[PDB]
């Protein structure tokens, strides 16, 4: 939330002090989460290695 460059706003209002927050989940639950994403979210590569003489 930039008041000098409004071009890059990505949220309705600024996170001011005293705002209400919460944590999603349970106290100490353990689970195996599902996932969802776009193609251009993460990227993976494998570096080839050099031969030792």
């Amino acid at each position: 939330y930039d008041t000098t460059n409004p071009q890059y706003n990505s949220v309705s209002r600024q996170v001011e002090a005293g705002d209400a927050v919460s944590v999603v989940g349970t106290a100490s639950q353990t689970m195996k989460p599902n996932l969802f994403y776009n193609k251009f979210f993460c990227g993976l590569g494998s570096i080839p290695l050099p031969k030792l003489h």
Binding site: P48, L49, P50, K51
Partner: protein, 148 residues
């Protein structure tokens, strides 16, 4: 056999006879504190050109004392003492002698001999690597890295 700031300063004062057993003169307290803080400042300045040589500094807000352990190696004692004498003599307005200057230069040269680097310039980075090294075609090993 560890060195001390008091020992190094006393060596410098005896070397020009400002205070020594050969003469009947005895150390004045004011001369010793001046030697100690001048030595500390000279080492702080030396941290650049000759390079780090192992001096142990005084922890902040605490003044250095003649009984503190300097931590310097024994072999650097003559060089450090002669440099201290050269930057000390102006206090009593004495004039260095040619033999003193020659000894100081010899000690400085001997100290500097042990700190040479010769950085040994490396390759360029786009220099081709020959076919005699049998490079790996997929890897980016057809050319020299030539960086950090």
């Amino acid at each position: 056999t560890v060195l001390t700031k008091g020992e190094i300063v006393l060596f410098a004062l005896r070397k020009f006879a400002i205070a020594s057993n050969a003469s009947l003169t005895d150390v004045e307290p004011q001369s010793i504190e001046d030697g100690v803080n001048d030595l500390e400042d000279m080492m702080s300045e030396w941290m650049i050109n000759p390079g780090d040589i192992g001096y142990a500094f005084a922890t902040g807000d605490e003044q250095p004392l003649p009984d503190d352990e300097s931590g310097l190696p024994r072999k650097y004692k003559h060089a450090v003492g002669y440099q201290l004498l050269l930057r000390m003599l102006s206090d009593y307005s004495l004039e260095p002698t040619p033999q003193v200057l020659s000894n100081a230069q010899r000690s400085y040269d001997a100290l500097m001999t042990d700190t040479l680097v010769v950085p040994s310039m490396r390759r360029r980075g786009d220099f081709p690597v020959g076919q005699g090294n049998k490079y790996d075609v997929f890897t980016s090993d057809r050319y020299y890295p030539g960086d950090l």
